Every structure is written in structure tokens, then in C-alpha cells.
Design a protein around this ligand. Sequence first.
Ligand SMILES: Nc1ncnc2c1ncn2[C@@H]1O[C@H](COP(=O)(O)OP(=O)(O)O)[C@@H](O)[C@H]1O
Ligand SMILES: Nc1ncnc2c1ncn2[C@@H]1O[C@H](COP(=O)(O)OP(=O)(O)O)[C@@H](O)[C@H]1O
Ligand SMILES: CC[N+](CC)(CC)CC
Ligand SMILES: NCCC[C@H](N)C(=O)O
Ligand SMILES: [Cl-]
Ligand SMILES: [Cl-]
Ligand SMILES: [Cl-]
Ligand SMILES: [Cl-]
Ligand SMILES: [Cl-]
Ligand SMILES: [Cl-]
Ligand SMILES: [K+]
Ligand SMILES: [K+]
Ligand SMILES: [K+]
Ligand SMILES: [K+]
Ligand SMILES: [K+]
Ligand SMILES: [K+]
Ligand SMILES: [Mn+2]
Ligand SMILES: [Mn+2]
Ligand SMILES: [Mn+2]
Lengths: 1059, 375
Amino acid sequence: MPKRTDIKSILILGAGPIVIGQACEFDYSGAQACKALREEGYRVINVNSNPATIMTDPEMADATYIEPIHWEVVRKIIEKERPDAVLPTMGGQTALNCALELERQGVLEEFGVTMIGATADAIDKAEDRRRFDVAMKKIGLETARSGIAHTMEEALAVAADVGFPCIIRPSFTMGGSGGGIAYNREEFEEICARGLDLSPTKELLIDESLIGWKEYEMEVVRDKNDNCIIVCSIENFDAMGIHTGDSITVAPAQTLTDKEYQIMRNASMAVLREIGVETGGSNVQFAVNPKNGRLIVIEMNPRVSRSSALASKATGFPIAKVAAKLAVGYTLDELMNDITGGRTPASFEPSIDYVVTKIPRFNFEKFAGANDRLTTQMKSVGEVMAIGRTQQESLQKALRGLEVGATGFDPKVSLDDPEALTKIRRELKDAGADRIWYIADAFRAGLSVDGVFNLTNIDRWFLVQIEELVRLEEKVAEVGITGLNADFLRQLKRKGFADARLAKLAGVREAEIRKLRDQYDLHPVYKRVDTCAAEFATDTAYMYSTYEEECEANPSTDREKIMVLGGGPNRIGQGIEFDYCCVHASLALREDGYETIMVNCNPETVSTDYDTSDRLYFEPVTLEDVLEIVRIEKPKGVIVQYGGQTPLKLARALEAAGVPVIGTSPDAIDRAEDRERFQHAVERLKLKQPANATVTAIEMAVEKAKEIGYPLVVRPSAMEIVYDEADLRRYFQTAVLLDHFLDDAVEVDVDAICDGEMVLIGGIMEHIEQAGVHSGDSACSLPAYTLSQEIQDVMRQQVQKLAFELQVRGLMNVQFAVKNNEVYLIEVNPRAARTVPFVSKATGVPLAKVAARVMAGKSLAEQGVTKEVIPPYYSVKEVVLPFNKFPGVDPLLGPEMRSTGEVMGVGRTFAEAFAKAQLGSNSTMKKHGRALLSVREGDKERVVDLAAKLLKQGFELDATHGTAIVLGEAGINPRLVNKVHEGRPHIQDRIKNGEYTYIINTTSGRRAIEDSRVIRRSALQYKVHYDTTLNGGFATAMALNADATEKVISVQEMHAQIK
Amino acid sequence: IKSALLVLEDGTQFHGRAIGATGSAVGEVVFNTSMTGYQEILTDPSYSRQIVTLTYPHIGNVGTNDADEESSQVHAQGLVIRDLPLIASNFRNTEDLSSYLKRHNIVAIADIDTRKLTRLLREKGAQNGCIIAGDNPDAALALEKARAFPGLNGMDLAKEVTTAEAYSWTQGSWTLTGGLPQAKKEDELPFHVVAYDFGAKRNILRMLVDRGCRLTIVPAQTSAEDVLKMNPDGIFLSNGPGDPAPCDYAITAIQKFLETDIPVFGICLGHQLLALASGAKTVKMKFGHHGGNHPVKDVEKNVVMITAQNHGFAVDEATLPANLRVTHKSLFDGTLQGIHRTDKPAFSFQGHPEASPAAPLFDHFIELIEQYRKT
Ligand SMILES: Nc1ncnc2c1ncn2[C@@H]1O[C@H](COP(=O)(O)OP(=O)(O)O)[C@@H](O)[C@H]1O
Ligand SMILES: Nc1ncnc2c1ncn2[C@@H]1O[C@H](COP(=O)(O)OP(=O)(O)O)[C@@H](O)[C@H]1O
Ligand SMILES: CC[N+](CC)(CC)CC
Ligand SMILES: NCCC[C@H](N)C(=O)O
Ligand SMILES: [Cl-]
Ligand SMILES: [Cl-]
Ligand SMILES: [Cl-]
Ligand SMILES: [Cl-]
Ligand SMILES: [Cl-]
Ligand SMILES: [Cl-]
Ligand SMILES: [K+]
Ligand SMILES: [K+]
Ligand SMILES: [K+]
Ligand SMILES: [K+]
Ligand SMILES: [K+]
Ligand SMILES: [K+]
Ligand SMILES: [Mn+2]
Ligand SMILES: [Mn+2]
Ligand SMILES: [Mn+2]
């Protein structure tokens, strides 16, 4: 059947802020869904609280809502837009979850909204773990022996039954959220308590262990006619027991016989039929006993996911696009296959002639105290993908593309460490993020394949391959550079060894390997992705590098090309924000007429959607890889300022190699990025910077420290604030630059553009949290909500001075600190910053598109973008922290960034924006109850007011000793509460018992912090809203006066208010 | 350094590594897009005189096992792949690939640009080639032998693989649990089908059994007369290698059954013969259909099937006789995939049906055979 006509308008539910387990994939999927529907004449309405998405770009849809993803809010949206249908499968579990709440609240009924893609019942059937398990048995498919639990006593009873270790999986969660592996009763109660609480349906599924079996996934699509295809198969590298998202995985499956494959493929299909997925895609997970092919169904996700994005990139089959069309009545046979120049229908099973490898990206180093072992709950923050003709080639390219400083299998331990074998063993038995490297070290340390297998359960098929790489590395080391003859070098390159890894081996410079390659004329070729193993030609240029004979790049000799360097896998501090800019650069210059080439290997992004650019090279963003492209494309210009730190770091080298880098020069970038160079410029400019010093030795610091003046920011050559001499030392022990810490100052970010002729202020954002709390983790407002115009004008002027002095050409970002009516410079980032997307959304100006043009040669005047835009509404940005993923961490803000994502709040007043932002951030704040106050000395003065504002709003108060004393003297007599050591009952008790609905807790001083840790941890565990800064608490107070569900506005409308 | 080299008629050279027997192999070169199932492809008679190129780079990850043998032997002239894995890793493997190829005395080459090859074959259609594995492969020789090859156009290949003397097969399908079952006893199979071994695959047979069919496999040329003599609930024309065209023998026979109200079911090559005997005409494809992800529509039901294809020629839909109704077409290329006699109990499928435990096809056959005995 063709497109449905009893439907005109469709509401698409977005995923919300990026978090671990639910990331970019949904902006990729969401955009695809918009695109798809919009191409089919539907009127599209969508909601997504996350501004850094392409999906929320006004030009992508009819009605765009950047509002808190709360059912009430959505209700308002439904009531105001009257969508005929609702597509809830393109937005993670947020979207599933919301769809179902809406439906449960009768909102859908009330407005006649039909749910498409997947019905509510089907979703439930898959998301309710008990139902799911009942379906499989109904279908005769096997599952782990298990029990459902709604309570702890039930949980324990299941546990007695299945034994330890056992696996815990909550209903209505994903990415292992709220789950884990229990090896003992203790662990068991902890995880169960957590998942029962996190489960939207307060339900757990508890299984017996299959730890170590092989883990597989299949991507399935099914139309209303019952047509049904496997888009992709995935074999996990890491065994069952480590979440698919935290595992290294490959496409396609490698160790199943055709017979097992078919059985798995039949099962997958049946699973979809039983669940009821009739018009969309689904991911089916299985477990296979390597010893006898025994197959067990694990779960199913009735929607798009991180695997389907991966699968889509892996095969060139746009899962979400197709699915968005099935949603509207189309059938597979009716749709054309995207990359094969519409020459074949979408109704077929892809076939690939290469190997795809995906590697998760972690950020453990940002989480002190965190359990860093891999388990069933996702802990990764991103992922990289690679394509190679061989698994070997595939894997090594992924490694080098991970952005973790590896060049392949770089060693972790020393050959001569007598303890190594022991470290290795550990790392192998109990996997961490580094395991892959330890596997190579094991082979260097003399462990056999069988020995590694046994500790890891990783299929030998894989293991032997790594071992063979090692032995090749060893030869490299023997023979050295002299042994690096064409045949050998070619061999090595075929197994994907990087010039750099080889260079370390032969003890020479990466550049020397590169030269050798030039000499020998040993360069890679480019294959194209086509979904069909070359059975049909493709008119798409989606390419990957390999060492083979025939090249398919066929670059145009025709146009002026522009290259955009992507950021690689996402990481904390390096997220979707940068990718958004990349996409815009591309869209804008393509539209302008250039041939746009995109270089990136992040499977979750829109950047890596072949639709996004003219040419896509799905490759590691490194010097080697880039140069090879440049070599053949001979581009007019290369943009290195939009992908974050990754491309930023390649800048000098690229230019050194003759690459035509456009926009702010690499040297200019350096001026800003190098502290010294930087202080000189400030000096030159006669600006104000905090006092600083570079200290080598201890005593040197203590002294210098006396000059500078405490407190101080201790940034090495992981940051820290030291208050005194003792502190100084104190740090010194545990642990360099030294900067006076600007206490009680307001932090501001400013995004601007410079074309060498003029400077455009994109936006001035005032942080809620003061300087000392990383900008990446601070909430902020555009326009500022407390700074004077006077002082903003001063920052404006400094921005201009700096722009010119540094020779910025494109985007720039400036960070100041305001104290006592004085502006202080904190730093300059001569490139696109993470606030860019938010600023664009808030001001209606696509800065990235503008700066890109500038970079390419079109001035600000020529473009007609020369005046700063100050919107008529407030825009507030709030963040989302991953602390709940790492209970061992003290959920406290500070000078280092830990947030994974962000949302935006739009309001008539600051209070209103803030309120929306806060709700959007998944805050459990309530407009009534008892508040706990426990603040540091410095805050003792302003607290009174806070206490009073809380009192007015109808809250009751509790406070700890010192705080109480202060409040008493001010006339406020809170109910006294015991510090844990003080006695009972104390805070933990009270927090634990639900006594609080809000907590305000501030702390200054390493030791004072370590002490108060317990308040913060309980607050988090118990879901009580908490603020760790006084500014924050005030903001929360203001928000009490507002109603985030009162009014909604589309982005079109917001923009339309701009004069 | 155990060299190997594959040369195309056209002079295109591919240098790689020997991973099979020492020697030379010549034949028409084809590409198969299947990601799994290499063993089954190799042991398919459909591949006689053919040089098989597998698009999926790693070939042999699971080793081999008898159960995965589709015939009593390796019918592939040679094997061209990109990478031969270091090990085989599957609970079912009984012998690594290299070892197996050696045993079956097959000349295989590894380490070449299969993708480039594939594109060639696809762009300029099939080609005859020669593989040379040994000490100092002679490119000129290889080119020679390549050019020298007759060709498959107009080659009756069915005669070369068919069995010598008829026989019974009462073996059904494999199971994970049961593996290959024991052969059923005659009184255990309702129906009695006579299968024309045009180089048929073990799967299909097990499938017919699975459906109550006790079968008597007969050689290619066997005479309808001789056939008709066994009072067969039905007749089945198996899959096989080469050109159907020159198999006058079977055509003749076929027509003979066609006068009868006996149910006739053809698969692949047999699908072409039926066609022929029904008056239609067969063409030789540019590169053919080789793989396991081929979309085929059942025009009648408007439903798509993902199938397994292993054909070099096809039946011309333009030159069909009115007594031939089109039952299936290829979604990839429109080609004809199946037909039924408007006037008789005879129909066929181009693809190669497979067990769940196609079925529709198969079932029909049975219902047809029943209707016939119910008469
Ligand atoms: N019985 C089991 N034994 C061992 N590991 C298991 C078992 N069930 C699931 N797992 C592991 O836990 C993971 C997450 O379970 P899954 O059902 O996929 O949850 P989610 O919906 O959160 O992704 C799997 O990818 C696998 O590594
Ligand atoms: N001297 C200082 N006084 C106060 N806060 C500062 C000072 N130096 C840095 N900060 C804080 O540390 C954060 C990180 O410093 P910055 O130089 O911007 O680091 P990064 O390179 O990580 O962006 C700022 O956003 C701010 O909260
Ligand atoms: C996974 C995203 N959440 C559940 C769907 C948790 C933050 C949004 C509330
Ligand atoms: N703006 C960052 C999140 C703030 C968190 N409520 C805290 O106060 O620590
Ligand atoms: Cl979740
Ligand atoms: Cl078992
Ligand atoms: Cl050598
Ligand atoms: Cl930034
Ligand atoms: Cl933890
Ligand atoms: Cl080659
Ligand atoms: K409706
Ligand atoms: K599920
Ligand atoms: K896994
Ligand atoms: K701040
Ligand atoms: K910085
Ligand atoms: K070669
Ligand atoms: Mn799931
Ligand atoms: Mn899962
Ligand atoms: Mn900064």
C-alpha cells in the first residue's frame, strides 16, 4: 500500500539531552524521520529538548518544539498542533516511554492522535520484560531461566532460584540502565533497589548467567504486507556479560554456519511477528553457546537504536528513513534502495564486501571512584566505527580512530615488568575499557590464544588475528626500518598498521614511514559502500580506505571542493555540538555550490549520513588518513575548526604537509591554545588576566603561590582549587600552572565571528553557576540575567580586540569572569565552541553556516549578517550529568567537565526559561515540601534570603548546625538535622526516608568536600532535587514562580519574534 | 610463498595466494554474494565447470562439515576469495577450508581484489578464466587456457553430473538437535516422486521427503516411457548446472508427461526445461543470479520473498506461450522467476527453495499430487 491519507500531520517524539546509553543516534534517526516524512508531504511536528540537534533545525520541519519532554508539555503540544498521528520510535526510550504515558493519560484519545510505526501494545509487549518472555515461550524460542520481581523480597526469591551470579534487567529501561551483574547478595540488593526504582514499571527481570556465550544482534524491518528483511547481523567481540553498547562489535556475524545463521534469521522474524512490529524496524538480540549452537533470545527493542544507526552506516541501508515511510503505509517493495541510484527496491537483504568494526569510547578518567569494569549497564560515552576489507584492517583503523591516543595496539605494560603477566591476567579476566590493548600485551607476554580465550571468552577467530598482528609488530621491531621493503610494508598496510605505529616500532618518525610509502607508491584505494557487494552500481560516494588494487574514488576535476573534518567518536566535552557545526558547514557550502567532503567515523551522527555531504569518507580523523584523501581530492580548503579537539590538533601538521587549511590559521589557533602565547597576547592587548605562574618544584609553588594569592587553580602541563599553603602541598603530594582563583565571580561565554573586517557577536551567555564550575556543566542564559549592559559592553569590546589580534577567520569563543565590576579573561577558543548550537537556536542565526561562509571567503557584510541579535525571550541552557551511571562518584560540580548533554528552556522571563530548562533536565524538583540547607561559610550570608524565598513558596526547612546558627540569627528557625557523625537522626536517614523534596548543599575545601559527600550521594540515589551552588539554588527558587507547562512555542514562532 | 594466479579471458590478472591444490583450473568465472554458506555453494552441482568468486571477504570462518555438503562432491572448478582466515572457529567444523579444498583437489586462490573482480564481471558480464596455483604461474599460459575455454553457452552440463543409475532417497532434513536424520522407510512415505537428477541438491530432496515424498532419483536422459512405468504420484525436475537448451532428451520427455495429468514440478534448470517443453525460450544472462539476498515477487499474492539464486540463464518472458502464466519475477531485475501451466498441473520456480521448516511452492506440489491421487 502507498502513503496513508487519513493522516496529514505527524508528531515525532525526540530523545532529549544526550546521555550515556542514549545518544546521537537519535538525532540521526530523528532527522532521517523528518526528512522522510517531509519528502512525503506530511506536515511534521516534533519535540526535542536538546538544541544541538539537526532535527530541531527549523528548516527541517513544520513545527518544532524545543521544550521539556514531559507528558504534560507534550499534551500542550498536541492540543496546540492537533497532529493526526504520533511516531514514537525514533527517540530512544524517552520517546517510547513518553508515548506510553501520553496514552495512559488518555491524551492521545482526547485528541485523536493515532500512534504509528509501532502500537502501544507492541511496544509494551517488548518493553514489559515478563510479557516479552511469555511471547518467546509462546513462540517456542528459548530464554534464560528467570523470574520477574516487583519487590525486593520477590527479587531475593528469584535470586535463590537462579543463583549467583545472576543478571538483572529492569522493564522499560535500556542501555542496561538500572541493571547489572550480581555476584553476591550485597551487590544484588543494591542493583535491584536501583532498577526497581528506575524501572518506569517498577519491575525487574532476573536471569541466570549466560556470561561468556557469544552475543549477536540482528536488525530487522517488516512492512504491513508482511514482507520481512534482515538489514544487518552483528557479532559481538566482547561476550555476553558486557552490554552490547560497551562491547566491540562487528558486522556481519563471523562465526555462525549458514545453518545457524538461518535459524537466527527465522527467530528474529518470528520475534517481530509475535511482538507485533508490523511497520518498522527492530533489533533482536541473541546469545549463542559456542559449544553447541544453542540459541537463546535475549530481548528486542521495538524501535531505532544505537545498533540500527550502526547497521545503517555499516550497510548503506537507511533504516530509519525506510521505517519512517513504512509508518505511513508504504511497503518495502514500493520504496527504492537509496544508494543504488534508486535502481533497486528497499525490499532485499544487504550484502557487504568488507568488515565493519565498532569500538566503544569511555571517559573513565573523568570519574574518580567509579567502578571501571565493564558490565551489563552501559558506561561508554560514545563510539567509533571503521570499515576495512579485512577484520584486521577493520579493527586497526577503529583503534586509530578512537581518539584515545592509540595508533593501534600500543602497549600498556612493560615487557620487563615481572608483575605484568599478573596485571594482564587481571585486565583480561575482568574487562575494563583497556582490555583490547591488554590482549595484545598478553600475546607479547607469552600467553597463548587458549589462555586469553579462557580469561576472556572472546572468540578465538578474533584472538588469532590480534596475535598475528603482534608477531608482525615484533618483526617490524626486529628488522627495523631497513627491513621495511615494499612487499613487507604493503603487507603491513594491508593488515591496517598505521604509519605511526610502524614508526614507533622501527623507532623512526611517522613522517618517515609516510615518505617510504610515497617512495614505494604505496597508497590505499577507496571502495564504496553500496548495500549489495558490488552486485549493483552506486551513484553515491560513501567511501572507505583500503589497500587494494582498484580505486573507486573518481574524484571530480570539475568543482571547488571543501573538506570538513569531523570529531570522531563523541566524548565528554566533545559531543554532538561539534558535529552539528560540521553538518552546517557542509549544508551551507553545498548549498553555496561547493563540492563538500566530509571526513568522520562516528556512526551515530548526521555528519556520517551520506545525505549530508557530496562526498563522505568514513575514516579515522588522523593525519595519515586525512592526507591520503587530500592527496587525491586536491581540495580548495579544509575546515579544522568545527570538529572539536580532534581536528584542531591536526592543524599544524596538515598545513606543514601543505594542506590548504582555511579559516583561523593553525598558528593563530596555537596562539590561543598555548597559555604562554596567550598571556602575551593579553599583555599586548593590555587586558586583564588573573595572576599566574608556572611552577616546577613544590617549594617554588608555595612561594610563587604567595605572590599569586590563594585561592589558586592548579592546572598541570585534571584541575584543582587550592585554598592555602597546606592545601598547596597537600595537593602536591597527590599530584604545573598556577592561577589565582577568581572567587565569587560570574562566568560568561561569548560566541563571535570575525571575517577580518568586522566582528559579529553571536551571543553573550551568563552562567548561573559561578566561575570554578566548568562552563560545560553550568546552566546559562541568553540574554544575561544579572550582568549590567555596561559590563557586557566591556566584554563585547575585548572580544573584538581579541578577534582582530588573533587573526580569527570564522568562529571564536571567549570566556570571561566578572568580579567586582571587573572583567577578567579566562580563555579564548579560536574555533567553534559547544555553545554554538544553542546560541543559533536561541538567536535564529546559524552561526556555523555563517562562519563557514566566512571561512570560505564570503564576508559578513556580503552575507548580510552584521548585527548582534538580542532575542525578545529568554533562552536557558541546562545540562545532564552522568553521575547516576557511576554511584561511586561524588555528584559534585567543579572546574572539570562531566556533563554528557544539554537541554534548552524558552521563556518570557528568566524564571520561565529556567523552569523549562530544569524540567527538561529531568529534575525531580517539587513546588512544595521540606528543604534541607547545609551551606559553606561564605554562603552563610546569602542563604538567609534563600531560606526566606523557600519559606514564602511554602517549604519547610531543615538545616545542619552552622547553617542553623546563621538562620537563627536572621530570624529563621529551621528544623535542626544531625550531621551523620553528630548522631540520629541525621541527614542520610532523613534523605533516605523521603523527608526532603529539595536540597541545597554547598562546600568549599577538599576535606570539607570529602566529608559532605554523603549528602550528595544520598540525594542522588533517592532522587531528591539538589543544587550544589548558591546561584543554582536561587535560580531554582525563581523557577518556583513559574509553570513550565503553561505555554509552549515552536522555534519558527520564536524566530518569527525576532526583529 | 605458494603463489597462485587468476587470469580472465580479457587479460585481467589477479595475483594472490594458493590455498587449495596445486594445478590449474579453467571455467566461467562467477561471483556469489552470499555471506555464509560457502560450503554449500562449493558442493552444488549447479557450479560445475565454474570458477566461484565470493564477495564476502572472509571465507572459511566456520571450516567445513559433511552435513554442509549439498552433493557427493565439490562441483566448483575453482575458488576465488579475498582472505582465508587463520582458523576455523565453529563447533560443527571438522576440517579447515584449505585442507578440504586440497582433499577435493580444488585449485583455489586467496588474497586478491575480489571486489574489483566482481565489478568487472558485473560491468562487462561473465568471463572465462583460468587459475594457476604453483611454483611459477605462467600468466601467458593462463590467458591461453582462458581464451581456449569453449564456454558454457550451449553446454549441456546436466549430463555430466547426473547419476549413473536411478536410486531411492528417503532422507529428510537436518536439525540442530538431530543433525541429519536416518533415512525413512518406504511405508513411511505416502507419495512417490520420481526425480530427474539434472545435478540436484541434497536440500531439495530432503525437503520433498519432509513432505511425505518417497523419491526415485533418475538420471537425466531417462525416458518418460520408462518413468511413466513406475506410476509416480509426481515428477520433479531438479536444479543443475549449465545451459538447458541442449538437453533435447529431457525436453522431449517432459512434453510427454505434459500430455498426462501427472503433476510436474521444476526447480531452477528444471524450471527452464519445463519452460522449453512448454514452448518458451531461454536466454543466457549477463552475469546471472548468484547469492542469497535476491528479492522475488509472487505476483499473485503481492508478497516478496528473499531467495537463493544460482543461475546463468533465464526464461524469456516475452516468448512465453499462453499456456504459461507468470508466477514470480525478480525484484532485482524483473526477470522471470516462476511459471505455471494454465492448462496443466505443472509449474516451476527459478530460485532454490529452502526449509524453515519454497513451502508454498512445495506445498502446492503436494496438494497437486493429492488432488491427482484423489482422482
Ligand atoms: N542471562 C544473561 N547472562 C549474561 N549476560 C546477559 C544475560 N542477559 C543479558 N545479558 C547481558 O546484558 C546485556 C543487556 O541486556 P538487554 O536485555 O539487552 O538489556 P537492555 O535493554 O538494557 O539493552 C546484554 O547485551 C548482555 O551482554
Ligand atoms: N582563575 C580562574 N578563576 C575562576 N574560575 C576559573 C579560573 N580558571 C578557570 N576557571 C574555571 O575552570 C573552567 C575551565 O577553565 P578553562 O581554561 O576554560 O578550561 P578548559 O580548557 O577545560 O575549557 C572554567 O569554565 C571556569 O569555571
Ligand atoms: C534514558 C533517558 N531517560 C529515560 C528514558 C533517563 C534520563 C530520560 C528520563
Ligand atoms: N547546572 C548543573 C547541574 C546542577 C546540579 N543541580 C547541581 O547543583 O550540582
Ligand atoms: Cl532507559
Ligand atoms: Cl547449553
Ligand atoms: Cl620481509
Ligand atoms: Cl567548546
Ligand atoms: Cl560506580
Ligand atoms: Cl588482485
Ligand atoms: K487520528
Ligand atoms: K526491550
Ligand atoms: K557483549
Ligand atoms: K560557571
Ligand atoms: K579550553
Ligand atoms: K594480491
Ligand atoms: Mn533493550
Ligand atoms: Mn540490549
Ligand atoms: Mn573553557
